[PDB]
Write a protein that binds this ligand. Sequence first.
Ligand SMILES: CNC(=O)c1cccnc1
Length: 164
Amino acid sequence: GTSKLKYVLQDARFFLIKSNNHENVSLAKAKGVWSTLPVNEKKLNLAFRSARSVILIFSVRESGKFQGFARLSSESHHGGSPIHWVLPAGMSAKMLGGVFKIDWICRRELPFTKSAHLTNPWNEHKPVKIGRDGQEIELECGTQLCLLFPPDESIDLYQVIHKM
Ligand SMILES: CNC(=O)c1cccnc1
């Protein structure tokens, strides 16, 4: 069903998260973590304190798809177990901010062709697939985008709801 999913997304904030490669999304899916540049780290930390759920919607550049979505479970922190991200050419690990813990809500993909009817008011009402890394997606567009993903029957949102 979709009811617990709608409950998790109620009054959420949503952010488009870009990855240069599939490897980093695979790491994020396996380890429940993400790390971004300080400019976006600061925005996500502010958002985490502001809303009952903050949703990251992931897209690998040039893939033509979203690879899933997850909810922040923490503000960023430093000093944890290192993560061997594959970073863009010319980027060292020290250029990243801290590490956010995330709980995956859907690990299934969604092709951009399926979201062509959704526009993001916070990016000039351009199609929601369009945006820089860290672009916020307004509530209604973000909710509808998440509801387009195929249901992920491997995930139980009971555990997510309790963290809220
Ligand atoms: C795992 N994180 C990354 O790959 C990245 C790279 C540049 C900017 N933001 C995030």
